[PDB]
Amino acid sequence: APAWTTFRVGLFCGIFIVLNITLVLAAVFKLETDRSIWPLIRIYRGGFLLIEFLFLLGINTYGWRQAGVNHVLIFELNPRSNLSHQHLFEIAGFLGILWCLSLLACFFAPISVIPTYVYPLALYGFMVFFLINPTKTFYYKSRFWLLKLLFRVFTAPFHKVGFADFWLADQLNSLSVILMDLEYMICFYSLELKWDESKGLGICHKYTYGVRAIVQCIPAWLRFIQCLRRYRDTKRAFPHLVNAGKYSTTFFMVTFAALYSTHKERGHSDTMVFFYLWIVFYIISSCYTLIWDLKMDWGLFDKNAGENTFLREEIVYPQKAYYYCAIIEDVILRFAWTIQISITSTTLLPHSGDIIATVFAPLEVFRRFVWNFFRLENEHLNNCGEFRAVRD
Amino acid sequence: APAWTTFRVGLFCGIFIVLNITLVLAAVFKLETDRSIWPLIRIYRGGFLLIEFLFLLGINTYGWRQAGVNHVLIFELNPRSNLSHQHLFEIAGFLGILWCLSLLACFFAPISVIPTYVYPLALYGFMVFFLINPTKTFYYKSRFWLLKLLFRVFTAPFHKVGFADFWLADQLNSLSVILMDLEYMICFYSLELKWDESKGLGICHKYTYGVRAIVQCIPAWLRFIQCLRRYRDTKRAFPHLVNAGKYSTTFFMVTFAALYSTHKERGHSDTMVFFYLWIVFYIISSCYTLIWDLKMDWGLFDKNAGENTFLREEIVYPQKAYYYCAIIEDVILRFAWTIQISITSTTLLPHSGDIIATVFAPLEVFRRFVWNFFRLENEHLNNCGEFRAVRD
Ligand SMILES: CCCCCCCCCCCCCCCCCC(=O)O[C@H](COC(=O)CCCCCCCCCCCCCCC)COP(=O)(O)OCC[N+](C)(C)C
Ligand SMILES: CCCCCCCCCCCCCCCCCC(=O)O[C@H](COC(=O)CCCCCCCCCCCCCCC)COP(=O)(O)OCC[N+](C)(C)C
Numbered sequence: 001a002p003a004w005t006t007f008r009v010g011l012f013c014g015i016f017i018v019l020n021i022t023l024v025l026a027a028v029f030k031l032e033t034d035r036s037i038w039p040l041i042r043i044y045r046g047g048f049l050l051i052e053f054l055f056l057l058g059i060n061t062y063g064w065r066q067a068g069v070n071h072v073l074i075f076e077l078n079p080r081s082n083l084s085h086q087h088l089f090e091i092a093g094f095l096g097i098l099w100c101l102s103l104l105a106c107f108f109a110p111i112s113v114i115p116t117y118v119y120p121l122a123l124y125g126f127m128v129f130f131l132i133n134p135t136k137t138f139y140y141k142s143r144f145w146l147l148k149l150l151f152r153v154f155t156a157p158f159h160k161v162g163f164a165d166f167w168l169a170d171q172l173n174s175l176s177v178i179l180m181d182l183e184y185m186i187c188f189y190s191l192e193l194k195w196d197e198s199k200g201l202g203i204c205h206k207y208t209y210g211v212r213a214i215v216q217c218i219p220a221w222l223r224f225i226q227c228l229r230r231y232r233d234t235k236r237a238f239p240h241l242v243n244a245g246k247y248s249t250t251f252f253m254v255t256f257a258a259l260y261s262t263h264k265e266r267g268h269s270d271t272m273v274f275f276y277l278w279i280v281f282y283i284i285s286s287c288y289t290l291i292w293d294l295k296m297d298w299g300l301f302d303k304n305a306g307e308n309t310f311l312r313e314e315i316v317y318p319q320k321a322y323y324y325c326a327i328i329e330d331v332i333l334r335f336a337w338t339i340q341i342s343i344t345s346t347t348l349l350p351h352s353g354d355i356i357a358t359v360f361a362p363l364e365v366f367r368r369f370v371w372n373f374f375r376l377e378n379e380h381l382n383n384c385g386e387f388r389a390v391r392d
Numbered sequence: 393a394p395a396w397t398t399f400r401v402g403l404f405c406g407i408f409i410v411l412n413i414t415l416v417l418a419a420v421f422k423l424e425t426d427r428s429i430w431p432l433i434r435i436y437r438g439g440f441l442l443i444e445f446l447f448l449l450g451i452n453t454y455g456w457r458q459a460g461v462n463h464v465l466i467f468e469l470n471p472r473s474n475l476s477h478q479h480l481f482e483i484a485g486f487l488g489i490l491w492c493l494s495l496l497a498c499f500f501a502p503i504s505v506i507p508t509y510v511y512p513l514a515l516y517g518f519m520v521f522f523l524i525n526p527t528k529t530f531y532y533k534s535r536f537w538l539l540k541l542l543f544r545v546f547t548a549p550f551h552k553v554g555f556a557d558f559w560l561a562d563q564l565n566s567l568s569v570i571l572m573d574l575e576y577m578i579c580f581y582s583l584e585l586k587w588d589e590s591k592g593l594g595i596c597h598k599y600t601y602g603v604r605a606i607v608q609c610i611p612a613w614l615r616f617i618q619c620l621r622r623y624r625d626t627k628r629a630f631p632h633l634v635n636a637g638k639y640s641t642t643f644f645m646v647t648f649a650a651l652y653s654t655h656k657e658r659g660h661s662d663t664m665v666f667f668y669l670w671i672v673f674y675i676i677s678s679c680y681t682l683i684w685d686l687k688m689d690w691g692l693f694d695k696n697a698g699e700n701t702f703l704r705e706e707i708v709y710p711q712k713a714y715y716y717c718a719i720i721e722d723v724i725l726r727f728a729w730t731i732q733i734s735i736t737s738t739t740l741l742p743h744s745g746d747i748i749a750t751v752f753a754p755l756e757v758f759r760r761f762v763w764n765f766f767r768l769e770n771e772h773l774n775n776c777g778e779f780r781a782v783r784d
Contacts, residue, residue, distance in 0.1 A: 006395050010402020011409075018410040 005086050012093025019100035026107045035200030038354055039188050043120045044103055046181030049361055050127075051096045053175060056369035058088030063373055067316045069380045070392065075164050081141050091139070098123055106199070116198040120185065156225045160233060163379070163386040169226055173219040174368035177361040180344060183215045206347045213258045213345055220250040230385070239296070239385060246288045253281040253338065254345045261346035278342070286338045293330055296384070298374035300327065314381045317373070326370050333367040336360050397478050404485025411492035418499045427592030430746055431580050435512045436495055438573030441753055442519075443488045445567060448761035450480030455765055459708045461772045462784065467556050473533050483531070490515055498591070508590040512577065548617045552625060555771070555778040561618055565611040566760035569753040572736060575607045598739045605650045605737055612642040622777070631688070631777060638680045645673040645730065646737045653738035670734070678730045685722055688776070690766035692719065706773045709765070718762050725759040728752050 031037070062085040064071040072082050102123040106116055131143050152159045153169050172179070187204035194201070207213065227244035231237065260274040294300045300323065302312040311323050340360040343353045378384060383391055423429070454477040456463040464474050494515040498508055523535050544551045545561050564571070579596035586593070599605065619636035623629065652666040686692045692715065694704040703715050732752040735745045770776060775783055 001395060003393060003398050006398040007402040007405075010399040010404075011406040012402075013399075014403040014406025015410050017403075018407050018414075022410075022414070 001084070001086060005090060009086050009089045009093060012090060012097055016093050016096045016100060019097065019104065023100060023103055023107075026104065030107055035198070037200065039184070039192075039202070040106060040120075040199060041354070041358060042181045043185050043188075044099065044106075045358055045361065046178045046185070047095075047099045047102075047120075047123060047127075049175060049178050049181075049365055051092050051099055052362055053171070053365050053369075054088055054092035054095065056365060057372075058085040058092060060369060060372045061085040061088060064376060067377070069316065069376050071376055071380075073392070074376060074379050074386075075167070076162060077145075083139070083142050087139070087142075095127065098126060115195075116200075117189075117193060117195065120199075121189075124182075124185075153222055156222050157229050159229075161226045161230050161386075166223075166226060166386065169219060169222045171368060173223060174364055174371075176216055176219050176341070177344070177357070177364070179215050179218060180212055183212050205350075207258055207261050207345075210258055210262075213254055216254055216341060216345060217251055220247045220254075223247045224251070243292070243296075246285075246292055249281060249285040249288050250341070253278070253285040254341065256281055257342045257345035261348060264348060282338055282342060286335050289338075290331060290334045293334065293371065294327065297371065297378065298326075299378040299381070300374070312378075312381075316377055316380070323374070326374060329370060330367065333363055337364050337367065340364065393476070393478060397482060401478050401481045401485060404482060404489055408485050408488045408492060411489065411496065415492060415495055415499075418496065422499055427590070429592065431576070431584075431594070432498060432512075432591060433746070433750060434573045435577050435580075436491065436498075437750055437753065438570045438577070439487075439491045439494075439512075439515060439519075441567060441570050441573075441757055443484050443491055444754055445563070445757050445761075446480055446484035446487065448757060449764075450477040450484060452761060452764045453477040453480060456768060459769070461708065461768050463768055463772075465784070466768060466771050466778075467559070468554060469537075475531070475534050479531070479534075487519065490518060507587075508592075509581075509585060509587065512591075513581075516574075516577075545614055548614050549621050551621075553618045553622050553778075558615075558618060558778065561611060561614045563760060565615060566756055566763075568608055568611050568733070569736070569749070569756070571607050571610060572604055575604050597742075599650055599653050599737075602650055602654075605646055608646055608733060608737060609643055612639045612646075615639045616643070635684070635688075638677075638684055641673060641677040641680050642733070645670070645677040646733065648673055649734045649737035653740060656740060674730055674734060678727050681730075682723060682726045685726065685763065686719065689763065689770065690718075691770040691773070692766070704770075704773075708769055708772070715766070718766060721762060722759065725755055729756050729759065732756065 061071070061083070063069075065085065072079050102119040105111075105119045109116055109119075130138070132147065149164055149168050153165050153172070156165070156169070159165065184204055188199075188202065192202045192204055193199060224244050224247040227240045227247065231240040231244070234240070256274060256277045260271060260278055263271040263274055300311050304313045305311055306313050308315055308320055308323075310327070311320065315323070317323070337360070340357050343349050344357055346353075349356070379386070380392065383389075453463070453475070455461075457477065464471050494511040497503075497511045501508055501511075522530070524539065541556055541560050545557050545564070548557070548561070551557065576596055580591075580594065584594045584596055585591060616636050616639040619632045619639065623632040623636070626632070648666060648669045652663060652670055655663040655666055692703050696705045697703055698705050700707055700712055700715075702719070703712065707715070709715070729752070732749050735741050736749055738745075741748070771778070772784065775781075
């Protein structure tokens with residue numbers, strides 16, 4: 001833990017705090033209500049979810065290292081240059097500084113020639129360039145490993161599914177709103193944005209063509225084909241076929257939600273039965289993922305609970321109360337997770353859908369933040385598939 | 393070096409940087425030229441000089457610890473809770489955050505009932521309360537020791553002059569502008585400020601009564617009586633009587649400057665001879681302090697220079713170039729130091745005097761910042777009076 005790294009973490013955090021406060025007062029006072037800000041909120045929602053995910057991942061690394069979870073061995077990382085929680089805090093703070101600067105430039109641009117629509121373009125282009133720059137520049141090893149993971153995950157059936165690919169695909173499953181906002185950004189730029197004055201003032205916000213439904217299922221598709229690949233490598237059905245079944249319930253729920261969405265403005269009598277199928281598959285998907293979490297992901301509700309009631313025997317975290325609020329928050333937010341996926345899969349809430357999505361996506365990142373703790377603790381305690389060698 | 397301390401240093405530094413930038417744009421755009429801002433600049437000049445002194449003192453502690461200067465033994469500090477450079481950076485950043493917040497409130501006050509003249513009052517009252525709070529609150533040991541020093545320095549003839557009293561009196565000699573702005577603050581509040589609207593829109597800025605001349609000589613008076621006390625304790629004249637002579641040259645230069653100032657508006661023919669005496673004593677004071685610096689304070693220009701030309705034999709700092717720019721900057725700024733004392737002692741520059749003082753006081757703090765390095769290095773190498781036991 002070098003002193004300059006901690007100093008950079010504090011410096012970036014302080015600049016981020018003051019820039020967030022400035023953003024707040026700018027929104028109340030400087031921001032004008034004439035311009036529609038929803039596309040801006042969607043683009044910067046994708047950015048903010050990425051930064052929040054990095055910050056919560058830093059907290060996750062802190063918890064793993066100071067609880068005993070050997071995440072370095074589980075992630076199959078070299079125990080020489082593994083990213084510490086401080087480095088994740090530094091990256092999150094730096095990208096948050098860029099995000100806040102881009103947002104402030106969108107509110108008031110202190111440049112006469114530069115237009116407003118380039119600040120999101122410049123911000124996300126800077127994220128991409130920082131990720132893919134060939135030179136041995138900041139954190140070269142970390143982003144090279146991350147880029148290899150991003151290549152292996154998005155081409156799943158052709159690579160053996162290790163722990164890192166599975167984990168990253170699940171994080172993308174929680175961060176599907178980032179892909180959704182990226183697709184919305186591309187569609188808005190290509191179709192709806194007038195490259196004349198600004199990004200304020202749309203066909204890309206509905207399911208006229210249903211492309212973002214494929215985008216929504218993309219992380220579920222990667223996880224589905226990863227489970228199928230694991231079945232192909234190891235001819236066993238209990239973990240992998242049932243997990244792929246869970247992801248296919250996500251598939252059916254999303255597509256039935258989309259069918260109901262297009263059928264409202266259409267008007268066939270099959271709309272009511274498409275509803276009924278939607279609640280059926282919504283309940284199936286929500287309970288499937290929730291029971292999978294508590295039983296196979298977290299490992300709780302074991303029959304060897306002992307003193308730790310409604311939990312497992314071995315526990316590495318200090319307070320059982322943490323496990324209990326984790327269970328409660330998982331039950332609450334898994335239904336909200338399916339709800340937000342459903343409304344993002346439909347167009348029937350053009351009044352509240354945007355706000356409920358914008359306030360539930362950070363809660364979904366927080367759910368996966370809590371999910372990481374107990375998932376990797378369960379993997380550390382007893383192997384779940386991806387070790388095949390020892391318990392640790 | 394705890395991680396949280398470095399994090400706090402970085403956090404305070406980042407907030408300070410962003411608040412300084414915000415202050416800059418507020419001054420260019422938000423600030424209105426109708427209100428006179430000179431009293432505001434004087435009050436916050438005192439505050440800013442204190443914060444700059446703390447930051448440069450942190451740099452001094454860094455240099456002393458990583459060059460070999462045993463400042464803990466020289467300052468007669470307990471080697472258990474001695475303030476590190478990080479703690480000084482933390483204090484400077486925190487007080488700078490308060491200073492920036494008070495200045496921003498003076499520019500735009502987001503409170504309808506609270507008037508503008510309380511933000512400097514609240515800021516300096518908070519500094520005083522932080523310094524003198526009886527409870528074992530932040531840095532209790534450090535400020536208790538500092539308060540004991542502040543008591544021993546301001547009552548000099550009745551205490552034996554140790555190194556810490558001498559050093560602090562010299563720092564106050566460099567920071568006499570802080571006392572000047574404090575006296576101006578008190579006079580402005582008691583006489584010129586109308587407690588109706590604000591502090592903007594004076595008899596306290598001239599020498600109608602000549603009280604701030606006594607304030608200017610107060611640090612020189614403390615050093616003068618400290619040298620006399622050291623003569624009384626040790627009956628030797630070469631160091632102490634000559635040093636007291638130097639401080640008395642400061643006395644004569646200040647009082648002759650004041651006499652010339654009052655005699656311009658008076659109009660006697662003795663004004664020209666008071667001028668002539670002023671340049672005589674200005675040159676005497678400037679060369680006295682400058683030669684004292686290089687010869688007795690820093691110890692340079694020794695006859696055992698050897699390879700280190702125009703310097704001394706033993707050198708703890710890496711590059712001799714540092715010593716050379718230090719000599720050049722000392723020759724340049726000692727004349728500027730006497731110049732700023734003279735114009736603050738007079739009223740003949742009511743056009744440029746305020747600005748030259750406001751830009752030379754930070755340069756005077758920087759001169760004492762450079763002076764600390766070589767003074768305590770000289771004391772570390774060979775004893776100068778205040779050891780009497782060993783060379784170290
Ligand atoms: C509208 C929204 C548009 C969004 C824009 C597109 C997204 C921009 C993408 C760029 C931002 C991501 C910044 C990169 C941070 C990655 C840091 C990282 O991966 O640290 C990890 C830390 O190691 C760990 O596994 C512990 C914590 C788990 C790390 C999980 C990976 C982080 C995933 C975050 C990016 C996900 C991509 C999101 C795309 C939407 C890699 O470690 P290392 O490489 O340094 O050490 C391994 C040893 N070697 C290297 C030798 C093999
Ligand atoms: C208009 C302008 C008005 C200005 C307002 C009035 C000024 C406000 C005054 C309050 C601000 C000062 C904040 C206090 C910081 C002091 C920190 C400090 O003294 O650290 C020092 C660090 O120790 C050192 O000696 C090394 C560096 C040299 C320290 C020099 C003292 C600092 C002087 C700064 C204040 C000067 C006062 C200025 C008044 C104008 C004390 O160490 P310690 O007490 O923690 O450890 C010693 C062991 N014991 C305690 C057991 C004996």
